[PDB]
Amino acid sequence: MATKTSIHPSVNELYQRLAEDQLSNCFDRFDPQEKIRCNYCELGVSCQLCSNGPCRINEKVGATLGVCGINADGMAMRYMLLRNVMGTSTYTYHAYEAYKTLKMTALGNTPFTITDKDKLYQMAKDLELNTEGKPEDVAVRLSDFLIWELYRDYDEPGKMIEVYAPLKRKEVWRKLGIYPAGPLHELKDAAASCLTNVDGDYVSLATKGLRLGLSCIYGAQIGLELVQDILFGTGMPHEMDVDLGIFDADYINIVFNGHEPFVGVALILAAKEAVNQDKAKAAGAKSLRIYGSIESGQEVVQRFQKDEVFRGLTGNWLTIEPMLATGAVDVLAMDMNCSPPNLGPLAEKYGATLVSVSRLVRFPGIHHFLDYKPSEVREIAQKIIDIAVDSFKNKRHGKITPKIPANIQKAITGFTPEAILKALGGSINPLIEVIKAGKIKGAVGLINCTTLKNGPQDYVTVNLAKELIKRDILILSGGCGNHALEVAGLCNLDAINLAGPGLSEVCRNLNIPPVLSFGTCTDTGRISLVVTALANALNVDTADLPVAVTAPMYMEQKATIDALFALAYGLYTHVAPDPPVMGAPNLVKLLTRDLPSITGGRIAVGSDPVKVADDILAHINDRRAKLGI
Amino acid sequence: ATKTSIHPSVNELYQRLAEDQLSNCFDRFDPQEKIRCNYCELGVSCQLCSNGPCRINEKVGATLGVCGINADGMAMRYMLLRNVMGTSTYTYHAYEAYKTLKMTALGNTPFTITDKDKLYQMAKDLELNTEGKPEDVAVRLSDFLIWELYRDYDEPGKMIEVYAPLKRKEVWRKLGIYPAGPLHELKDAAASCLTNVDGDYVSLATKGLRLGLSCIYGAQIGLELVQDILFGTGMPHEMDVDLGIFDADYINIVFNGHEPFVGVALILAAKEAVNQDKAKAAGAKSLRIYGSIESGQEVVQRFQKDEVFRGLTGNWLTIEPMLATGAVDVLAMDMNCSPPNLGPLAEKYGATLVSVSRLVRFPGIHHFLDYKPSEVREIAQKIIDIAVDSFKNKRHGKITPKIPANIQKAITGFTPEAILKALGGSINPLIEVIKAGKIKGAVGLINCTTLKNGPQDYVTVNLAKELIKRDILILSGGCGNHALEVAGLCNLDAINLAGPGLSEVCRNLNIPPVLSFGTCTDTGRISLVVTALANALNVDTADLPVAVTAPMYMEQKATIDALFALAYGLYTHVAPDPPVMGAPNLVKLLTRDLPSITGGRIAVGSDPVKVADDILAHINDRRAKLGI
Ligand code: SF4
Ligand code: SF4
Ligand code: FES
Ligand SMILES: [Br-]
Ligand SMILES: [Br-]
Ligand SMILES: [Br-]
Ligand SMILES: [Br-]
Ligand SMILES: [Br-]
Ligand SMILES: [Br-]
Ligand SMILES: [Br-]
Ligand SMILES: [Br-]
Ligand SMILES: [Br-]
Ligand SMILES: [Br-]
Ligand SMILES: [Br-]
Ligand SMILES: [Br-]
Ligand SMILES: [S]
Ligand SMILES: [Xe]
Ligand SMILES: [Xe]
Ligand SMILES: [Xe]
Ligand SMILES: [Xe]
Ligand SMILES: [Xe]
Ligand SMILES: [Xe]
Ligand SMILES: [Xe]
Ligand SMILES: [Xe]
Ligand SMILES: [Xe]
Ligand SMILES: [Xe]
Ligand SMILES: [Xe]
Ligand SMILES: [Xe]
Ligand SMILES: [Xe]
Ligand SMILES: [Xe]
Ligand SMILES: [Xe]
Ligand SMILES: [Xe]
Ligand SMILES: [Xe]
Ligand SMILES: [Xe]
Ligand SMILES: [Xe]
Ligand SMILES: [Xe]
Ligand SMILES: [Xe]
Ligand SMILES: [Xe]
Ligand SMILES: [Xe]
Ligand SMILES: [Xe]
Ligand SMILES: [Xe]
Ligand SMILES: [Xe]
Ligand SMILES: [Xe]
Ligand SMILES: [Xe]
Ligand SMILES: [Xe]
Ligand SMILES: [Xe]
Ligand SMILES: [Xe]
Ligand SMILES: [Xe]
């Protein structure tokens, strides 16, 4: 049937049950779309932006330009920028709601508290805010300042990019003129440029894409992740259970799924109440348990420990459909991507109830809607707990047969730059010395999603991670590719012996895995804080560091914006499968050949793990040779 | 080319463009027709993630995309993502206008405060502080409107309470479509269109309605009122249109786009004697400034013709033939439409392309002058200088001019104040002429132009003729308004082409049967007319004998006004068909089920007679329900 499924045997076992129930799934839907693939759109030489279209680029038949007059390069780059507007919008949405959450928490209208006060005061100092009074007043000040960072216009200088970016990179950006405004104004200008007969210059549209990436990282991601640190704590390494074997059908299981962790931690807090556990027990279940899915669950497992209520991480987005096939989910609380639009019939067949906690998430089949609100989240949480208890009693218990796979995997989560400092001994210099000694050739930022385009689920990512660590290359993993690596067993101590000589030796001496789970794609900025550190200790530019960035199985634009950032950051950025720009030769030449003389980085292609690893190692060794190491 | 224009001048200049073996929109349309994608034409395509691209095809088994979305959600999501761009353009213009007003209040621009009466009346309607001198009040109004731009979800708006009718506001409350600021709304909509987020076409259509609402009451009304306060409220006056206004012996600077600040600065600087002496020293008779598309339309709404400013050239499909005249020296571009292939044409005909905005970029532009209110005085001068050299070294003596002879008269500058003055200071006379059957109803023709459903401006002009013959008044905005001005439907001569009652009313009031109200950005301005008639009757806007048509729409600045008209509860005609016709449930919601939700509905068709007949049938249905 489906030609490509997954590398995880649990996901395969559950896809087989999905297919046995004759329910549609992504794997089964891939091939019918393969039958009628459009090479125009796949090469990026098609457009749909105006009524004179739809236009295709075909010079051998006489259609050199669109009806407007744009060429293939401008077409591809403009479409890319247009959809990257969406990723910037998602990150800015997350950041704004995080700042609102911190503001409403500092004034006592949330079930949340200010956990990391050290980080709050350090941010207040570095951003030159007023530190007088209570910590909550400083939290309100930081909320307002980061909202202002969101709101910055084209003519107002920002402070986050001055604090969290190295000197030479800021020099490169100011000499390129790609110093961005606030992410709001930046995405506004990008979308306004993508309109018909506005911006049709592929160089200019790529410049605006780099501007949008910088806007996203320094105006949204860093601030939101540091505010989440202040709220729920800075992550420290701890052991965690992943893969779908963590499910138990005898419990009222609630799964939160999205990107923002507020609903999930509110559910954990409300489930710690004895009254709700007594409700779960009086309903006929053992107790009430909460599970974390994709990036929301990743955020939560970065900072929270495994107990009787919180049981771990389910997987990546391609695991959501088979997860419902377990027949063990009572509530799937959804706040952002991914919430696949055909989840209705699947939850109806397996006895699950779908609840959306966001005004962004809507699709056919949802049972309840509880738009997020910091002053309401507590109540929201409770309502979800009252929904599951009802669902469990009326739909799943004694009616749905569970099919929970046996695969449970150990994974070390919660790695942060502070955790790197702590494991090294408070200083980054030992990492410097093991990099200069040749034991660790370099570090790779694997900020990745997952997709069925360039192979089965997580094949490219996991096999490329193995190939990378085999060549003494450390990996900082974020995104759904990080979920893939945690499930595949590469994020625990047993994985030490899957690394090459130097990397395995150093990781055994430090008692850390060769793949450090830094969390989500939102942590890309956080990962930059590592590279910036490596750039500040050496007084060398980021483009000269033996570092690399890879998204071996990207899907939508939350990773394309991180790739555009890494390009503006001046890094070798591998992206697979091919973004739809290959029908534009000039843009391809700019992205893969010209940019190293503009920003410093370039775009790498390919889905072969061995060859991608070889090219990454070759770039790292070039950087080493020019560093004298 | 199988399709060109109904205007003789543009056909002649297309002939010259074809003589020079140069590419143009008319010629580029046909090669695209041989290989049209029916999928994208019907809106059953998607390119949002790497598991794609996907197409909806139930026969071969592709009922859903790899994500799981259906055709309805796919089409509506692509429509919402596209209209994000139009919302962004409107928000960009509004924010630049607010910054321009505030910087003018501090004495950093060549501008001033022309309409202080409107400044203070709007300050009082918004309950602002009237204290101090007009500069302070202007600063306060700018800050308030900027706050409107940044408004989020728990901050109720004040523009929508002041400028919207009662029953429409109650309907928007019970529907839950009361929008935030346009910035937050466009960001929320763009985030909803990401893969595996919002895949319900009903939710996406509700978000499109919210987007249009946040665009009209969060940007358009305020930006046009601010531009009025800066450059005076427009009043009806004579204007020359079509490309016959060009004279090759002068140094011609044409401002083209949407935002008119660069145009006003250019006019002001060109009126200076030193710049006219610079023009004369180059061998030219004098120095003239011309308006093009929507920026031109703003200026011609507010400015009369004189020795310097000459009027409007045409609409967007007239840009390439305009360069073909061989008379342009500088084409200053501030926004859309700026065709991305103007380089070779400007090289052939000796014109210099200048971009006065960081949004406009394409190969061949010779100078970039990103607009800043505190620099617009030095930009204009530079432009003028760039013209002088470009006159001496490129055009004068080498380029053969081919200026067409067609010139038309148009009465421009029709505003709600203009209607109120022409009616004697009250809305009751219009109520009487409508209730008596003289004017069956009014129609807002807010439109672009395109080659999709016919030659340039064919459907627009013919539909306007049929409407005015059916005793239906027309308020025209956008490039359709330019088409009507060039065709000669906005002067008194057009009264002979109106029906009996409409011609009687127009002869009594001395107005044309088509009122040139400005740009698509003036849709909200037109929304103030309907609202007024809704408040005098105490009826909802869905009960009024009004309608809205975009018979040759092109991009999303028109589709967002159509989404507003839908949320406004109006019969909204749009042609050609937007890419949704492959989504049966979405077409059902837009064309059939929306009357029970908002009151309005989408109408389709490019046959002028049938479209006018359906519009008149809707107006007569409303009339019968009103008892008139
Ligand atoms: S913007 Fe240009 S290329 Fe795109 S559909 Fe319109 S005419 Fe065709
Ligand atoms: S968003 Fe969905 S329908 Fe669109 S290309 Fe991706 S998988 Fe296909
Ligand atoms: S699917 Fe329409 S051009 Fe590719
Ligand atoms: Br094809
Ligand atoms: Br401090
Ligand atoms: Br402060
Ligand atoms: Br050409
Ligand atoms: Br086809
Ligand atoms: Br005074
Ligand atoms: Br003036
Ligand atoms: Br003079
Ligand atoms: Br300024
Ligand atoms: Br009025
Ligand atoms: Br009267
Ligand atoms: Br159709
Ligand atoms: S990602
Ligand atoms: Xe299904
Ligand atoms: Xe052909
Ligand atoms: Xe993309
Ligand atoms: Xe919020
Ligand atoms: Xe609370
Ligand atoms: Xe670039
Ligand atoms: Xe917490
Ligand atoms: Xe809130
Ligand atoms: Xe239920
Ligand atoms: Xe670090
Ligand atoms: Xe490390
Ligand atoms: Xe890295
Ligand atoms: Xe471990
Ligand atoms: Xe080590
Ligand atoms: Xe990075
Ligand atoms: Xe990219
Ligand atoms: Xe990336
Ligand atoms: Xe690329
Ligand atoms: Xe559209
Ligand atoms: Xe501005
Ligand atoms: Xe005010
Ligand atoms: Xe504001
Ligand atoms: Xe709707
Ligand atoms: Xe009128
Ligand atoms: Xe008046
Ligand atoms: Xe009326
Ligand atoms: Xe009207
Ligand atoms: Xe109207
Ligand atoms: Xe309107
Ligand atoms: Xe529309
Ligand atoms: Xe419209
Ligand atoms: Xe429609």
Author numbering:
A (entry chain A): 1 to 629
B (entry chain B): 2 to 629
Question: What do the authors report?
Answer:
Potential gas channels around the hybrid‐cluster were calculated for the oxidized and reduced structures of CooS‐V Ch using MOLE. Additionally, we pressurized CooS‐V Ch crystals with Xe to probe hydrophobic channels. Using the anomalous scattering contribution of Xe atoms at a wavelength of 1.90 Å, 64 Xe atoms were located in the four molecules of the asymmetric unit in which each molecule has approx. 15 Xe atoms bound.
Here, we report on the structure and reactivity of such a deviant enzyme, termed CooS‐VCh. Although closely related to true CODHs, CooS‐VCh catalyzes neither CO oxidation, nor CO2 reduction.
